[PDB]
Amino acid sequence: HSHGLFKKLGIPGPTPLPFLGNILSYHKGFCMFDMECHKKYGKVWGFYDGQQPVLAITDPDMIKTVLVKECYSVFTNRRPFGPVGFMKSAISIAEDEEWKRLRSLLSPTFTSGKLKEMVPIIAQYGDVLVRNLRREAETGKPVTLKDVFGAYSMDVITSTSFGVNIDSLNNPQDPFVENTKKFDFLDPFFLSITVFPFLIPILEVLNICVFPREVTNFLRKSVKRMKESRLEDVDFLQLMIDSQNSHKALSDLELVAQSIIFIFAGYETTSSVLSFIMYELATHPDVQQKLQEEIDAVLPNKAPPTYDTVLQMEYLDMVVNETLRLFPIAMRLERVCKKDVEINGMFIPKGVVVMIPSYALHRDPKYWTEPEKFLPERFSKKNKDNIDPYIYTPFGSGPRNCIGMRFALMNMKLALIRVLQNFSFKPCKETQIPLKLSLGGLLQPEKPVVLKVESR
Amino acid sequence: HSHGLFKKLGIPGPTPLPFLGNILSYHKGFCMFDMECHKKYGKVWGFYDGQQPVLAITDPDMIKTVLVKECYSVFTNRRPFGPVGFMKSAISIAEDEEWKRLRSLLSPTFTSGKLKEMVPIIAQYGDVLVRNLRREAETGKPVTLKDVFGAYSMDVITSTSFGVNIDSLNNPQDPFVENTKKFDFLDPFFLSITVFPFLIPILEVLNICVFPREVTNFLRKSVKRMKESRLEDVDFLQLMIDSQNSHKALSDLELVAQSIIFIFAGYETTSSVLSFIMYELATHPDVQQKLQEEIDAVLPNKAPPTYDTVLQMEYLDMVVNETLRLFPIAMRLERVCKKDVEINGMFIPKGVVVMIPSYALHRDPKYWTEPEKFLPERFSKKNKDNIDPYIYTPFGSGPRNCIGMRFALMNMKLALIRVLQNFSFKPCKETQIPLKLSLGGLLQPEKPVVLKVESR
Numbered sequence: 001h002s003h004g005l006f007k008k009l010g011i012p013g014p015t016p017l018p019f020l021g022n023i024l025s026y027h028k029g030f031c032m033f034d035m036e037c038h039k040k041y042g043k044v045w046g047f048y049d050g051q052q053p054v055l056a057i058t059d060p061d062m063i064k065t066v067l068v069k070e071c072y073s074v075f076t077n078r079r080p081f082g083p084v085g086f087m088k089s090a091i092s093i094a095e096d097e098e099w100k101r102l103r104s105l106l107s108p109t110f111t112s113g114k115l116k117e118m119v120p121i122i123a124q125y126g127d128v129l130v131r132n133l134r135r136e137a138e139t140g141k142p143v144t145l146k147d148v149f150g151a152y153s154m155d156v157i158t159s160t161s162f163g164v165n166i167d168s169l170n171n172p173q174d175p176f177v178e179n180t181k182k183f184d185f186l187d188p189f190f191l192s193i194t195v196f197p198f199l200i201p202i203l204e205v206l207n208i209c210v211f212p213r214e215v216t217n218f219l220r221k222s223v224k225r226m227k228e229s230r231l232e233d234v235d236f237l238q239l240m241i242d243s244q245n246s247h248k249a250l251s252d253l254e255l256v257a258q259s260i261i262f263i264f265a266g267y268e269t270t271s272s273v274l275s276f277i278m279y280e281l282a283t284h285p286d287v288q289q290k291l292q293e294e295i296d297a298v299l300p301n302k303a304p305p306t307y308d309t310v311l312q313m314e315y316l317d318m319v320v321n322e323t324l325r326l327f328p329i330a331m332r333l334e335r336v337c338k339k340d341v342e343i344n345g346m347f348i349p350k351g352v353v354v355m356i357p358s359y360a361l362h363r364d365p366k367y368w369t370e371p372e373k374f375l376p377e378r379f380s381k382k383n384k385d386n387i388d389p390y391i392y393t394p395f396g397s398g399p400r401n402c403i404g405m406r407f408a409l410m411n412m413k414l415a416l417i418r419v420l421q422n423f424s425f426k427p428c429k430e431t432q433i434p435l436k437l438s439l440g441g442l443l444q445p446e447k448p449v450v451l452k453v454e455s456r
Numbered sequence: 457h458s459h460g461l462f463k464k465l466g467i468p469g470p471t472p473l474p475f476l477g478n479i480l481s482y483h484k485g486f487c488m489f490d491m492e493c494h495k496k497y498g499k500v501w502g503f504y505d506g507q508q509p510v511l512a513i514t515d516p517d518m519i520k521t522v523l524v525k526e527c528y529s530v531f532t533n534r535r536p537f538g539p540v541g542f543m544k545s546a547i548s549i550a551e552d553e554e555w556k557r558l559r560s561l562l563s564p565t566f567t568s569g570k571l572k573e574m575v576p577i578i579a580q581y582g583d584v585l586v587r588n589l590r591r592e593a594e595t596g597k598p599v600t601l602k603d604v605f606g607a608y609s610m611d612v613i614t615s616t617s618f619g620v621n622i623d624s625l626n627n628p629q630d631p632f633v634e635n636t637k638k639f640d641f642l643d644p645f646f647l648s649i650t651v652f653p654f655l656i657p658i659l660e661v662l663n664i665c666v667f668p669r670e671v672t673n674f675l676r677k678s679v680k681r682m683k684e685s686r687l688e689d690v691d692f693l694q695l696m697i698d699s700q701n702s703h704k705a706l707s708d709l710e711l712v713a714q715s716i717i718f719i720f721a722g723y724e725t726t727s728s729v730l731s732f733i734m735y736e737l738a739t740h741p742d743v744q745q746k747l748q749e750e751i752d753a754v755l756p757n758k759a760p761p762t763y764d765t766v767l768q769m770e771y772l773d774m775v776v777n778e779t780l781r782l783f784p785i786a787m788r789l790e791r792v793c794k795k796d797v798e799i800n801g802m803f804i805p806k807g808v809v810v811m812i813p814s815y816a817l818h819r820d821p822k823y824w825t826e827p828e829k830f831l832p833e834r835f836s837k838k839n840k841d842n843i844d845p846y847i848y849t850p851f852g853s854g855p856r857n858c859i860g861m862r863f864a865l866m867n868m869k870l871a872l873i874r875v876l877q878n879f880s881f882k883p884c885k886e887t888q889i890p891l892k893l894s895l896g897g898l899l900q901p902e903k904p905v906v907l908k909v910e911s912r
């Protein structure tokens with residue numbers, strides 16, 4: 001029906017089947033399709049997620065236009081997603097003037113000023129991590145990183161965001177811990193979404209929420225207790241409540257929505273990435289040692305890390321940066337074109353979803369040498385300059401980039417510094433080498449990362 | 457020529473003489489003209505500063521529209537002022553997109569976060585004040601407040617904004633001190649401006665600057681030394697340099713311009729107001745004692761004040777608030793209407809300067825009882841609620857309000873707490889009672905405030 005679009009424009013792509021579009025091509029997962037598409041077709045191509053035209057662009061002047069130059073005018077929202085229900089107000093979801101309000105009202109949550117105030121707390125759980133890690137290191141049992149990293153990152157969220165302090169590895173079943181741990185695209189549901197996006201309004205009317213209709217009701221209330229327990233008697237909720245004291249302040253259920261996408265991401269990104277990094281440290285043993293040295297020449301005597309010294313560790317930075325090059329958990333960035341528009345000499349008509357294929361661009365040999373080896377020296381202050389910030393985009397770019405970037409980078413670095421101060425990480429046999437990525441829809445490993453840990 | 461405007465609109469006012477407009481009416485100073493005009497004419501009137509129509513509005517729904525609701529759309533800039541030269545870029549001066557850039561790029565200079573970081577410094581000079589005050593208190597010589605307060609506030613600026621630490625009362629002639637101390641409306645010049653505003657372009661072409669063409673050249677350079685002396689080896693300049701590291705960063709001479717209007721205001725407002733307050737404490741002896749008690753029940757043993765406890769002193773707040781009611785150093789707020797527009801049912805045509813007569817409204821019996829007595833209980837948490845924030849406007853309102861409000865309130869409170877911890881202030885004979893305001897163009901006293909100081 002609407003499949004003629006790129007045939008007209010003179011824009012190339014894979015021919016789309018009726019109804020499906022090009023979705024059968026995701027049997028290899030988004031990343032492989034993107035990569036293949038980049039090389040078969042070059043710098044611009046089109047496909048159809050159902051009847052939804054998606055235009056993939058790989059020019060960094062053009063990417064800059066979409067992510068930064070013309071964000072407010074044309075390319076302000078991401079792809080409609082559903083059913084959400086009361087999570088329509090979550091910032092990552094919200095659109096246009098509702099977004100801009102929330103982004104403003106939630107921006108100073110992550111300033112150098114407030115990020116630095118959170119450092120002492122994100123400390124006390126790095127220590128909890130060591131002790132939970134040493135019990136697995138004096139008992140030579142290979143360690144599922146995501147698990148031990150998960151509970152750590154989880155401990156950081158509840159703390160950085162509500163107060164609630166839990167040894168979540170130890171209290172894996174505390175009511176605040178169950179809820180919070182709780183399929184995403186490429187699975188039985190969202191493929192149907194993309195083929196039956198007309199069926200989304202069906203469920204919105206049904207209180208059916210992708211976020212299960214129960215985890216929400218736990219934290220909706222648990223907040224308005226906390227709300228009514230410190231009021232009256234440092235974290236994200238606190239920082240959000242003071243802000244509803246221009247625009248229109250912050251409504252009550254809008255607060256619970258932003259908390260949820262804060263609890264995710266702080267959990268699943270931070271812990272997912274720390275395992276990609278630790279897998280990389282194990283499989284490239286020289287880098288781990290180089291880092292363990294710098295960690296120690298800044299913080300001698302296994303010294304506890306601080307704000308200013310974490311930004312002082314450069315090899316630490318380069319390692320994180322390079323792990324994210326190889327695993328940009330986002331994979332793609334996306335904005336809905338809201339007007340007939342022409343950027344850098346190309347007509348983009350209304351409603352086209354515009355897509356930047358991060359994962360593919362991070363592995364493009366046209367910009368990276370040996371792009372699949374793990375080469376942390378790419379990010380040296382010698383070579384960091386020669387890197388197009390519109391090709392390397394692990395946090396997006398522009399006014400709709402990741403709001404948690406600074407906190408995310410600091411969360412993970414405070415982990416590694418503590419964790420590399422006391423242990424070293426060797427591979428095991430059941431350790432997956434080389435790591436295989438999930439054929440699914442998420443930048444996650446086929447098999448969880450298991451490594452051997454050793455006390456120093 | 458253009459004097460028919462309010463005669464048409466059906467808007468009332470004093471009939472304007474040719475060329476002059478209504479300026480001869482300023483022989484009683486703006487405030488008295490505003491007050492008289494409010495009572496002769498009511499809620500809306502017009503006059504002509506030369507050929508410049510000025511519409512004075514006293515309705516707080518309408519004031520809110522002009523200062524907050526429609527700031528960005530219609531009422532975004534203040535009255536053209538000149539000649540300025542390179543001070544065209546100073547934020548208080550700049551217009552529209554240049555302003556909004558600078559206001560954004562200079563906003564997080566004054567956050568709770570950064571304001572709190574400045575508290576320890578604004579301390580060490582409160583102490584310098586005591587010792588400079590005790591030399592005048594063990595030597596019973598009546599004290600010119602503006603002088604001792606001036607050097608204090610001056611000490612705070614150079615410190616809060618560059619580093620340079622001077623005992624300016626002691627070093628009254630240090631090169632950084634002379635410059636920085638350096639007629640404003642109602643004097644031989646600006647009256648000619650308002651009658652010959654066509655002659656402003658004349659001087660702009662002449663490097664003639666109201667800011668003398670020399671003080672600027674001192675600080676322009678003194679900065680690019682400091683710029684090139686900490687780079688590389690907490691204050692306003694530092695906070696401004698890190699910010700040029702969306703929009704278009706911060707250009708180099710734009711930095712010097714914002715520094716100048718920072719050095720003023722931090723000097724002349726802070727010290728001007730502290731003398732209005734201390735004059736008031738002397739002439740109303742009961743309030744001074746009430747305050748000296750609360751200052752001591754928060755900070756016992758002449759304890760040094762801190763951030764959180766300054767916001768804890770409520771009678772301190774009420775006193776400042778009420779002094780500003782009686783002396784709003786601004787007197788008037790103003791915005792240039794940039795479109796034919798209709799707010800709250802009144803046509804305002806392009807180019808009309810829109811004026812809110814703060815001083816008059818703070819003394820309006822229609823909103824204030826005994827509005828001229830000094831009654832600090834007006835601002836009690838019992839009665840503070842019954843106060844239209846669009847009548848009481850010592851810092852303006854809305855997106856173009858005073859950016860230094862929080863710092864100003866905290867600067868002055870840290871002064872009074874220290875100064876009232878060690879001294880009490882009695883009037884003298886040559887002390888002007890009742891204070892007379894300058895017939896001139898500035899909210900300043902006819903005669904400087906002299907009081908008797910006594911050690912405790």
Ligand code: HEM
Nearest residue numbers: 092262265266269330394395396397400401402403404408
């Ligand atoms: C390694 C950690 C993380 C990575 C790689 C990451 C990556 C991203 C990316 C690529 C985007 C979209 C950028 C764009 O569209 O241009 C994004 C958005 C976002 N991220 Fe993160 N993120 C991380 C962690 C976090 C954390 C800890 C938070 C904390 C709450 C957070 C909050 C958000 C939000 C709210 C958005 C939506 C931005 C918006 O739509 O306004 N992220 N993230």
Ligand code: HEM
Nearest residue numbers: 548718721722725786850851852853856857858859860864
């Ligand atoms: C008792 C102290 C002060 C009072 C009563 C005061 C009052 C005001 C008022 C009424 C305005 C205009 C508001 C409006 O147009 O709606 C203003 C503007 C401004 N004030 Fe203050 N002010 C004070 C101190 C300061 C201080 C210490 C600074 C520090 C640098 C400062 C910086 C500014 C700036 C930059 C503007 C221009 C705002 C703009 O045009 O964007 N002020 N002040």
Ligand SMILES: CC(C)(C)OC(=O)N[C@H](CSC[C@@H](Nc1ccccc1)C(=O)NCc1cccnc1)Cc1c[nH]c2ccccc12
Nearest residue numbers: 078079080081092093182211260261264265269329330402
């Ligand atoms: C942004 C549109 C409207 C197109 O659809 C999405 O909302 N997005 C998708 C689906 S639900 C996003 C939500 N997830 C979440 C999942 C379970 C429980 C609670 C929340 C979210 O905001 N998590 C924050 C986050 C995650 C990763 C990195 N940083 C921040 C997922 C998504 C993939 N990458 C993103 C980048 C930004 C925003 C969303 C996503």
Ligand SMILES: CC(C)(C)OC(=O)N[C@H](CSC[C@@H](Nc1ccccc1)C(=O)NCc1cccnc1)Cc1c[nH]c2ccccc12
Nearest residue numbers: 534535536537548549638667716717720721725785786858
């Ligand atoms: C705002 C327009 C463009 C209409 O003309 C002015 O720029 N304004 C007038 C004249 S020069 C403003 C400048 N003074 C200054 C004087 C000598 C040396 C350096 C700077 C300024 O910005 N000082 C900051 C300030 C002063 C008082 C309270 N807070 C902040 C003066 C003026 C009276 N009340 C204001 C309120 C806001 C901005 C300016 C003024």
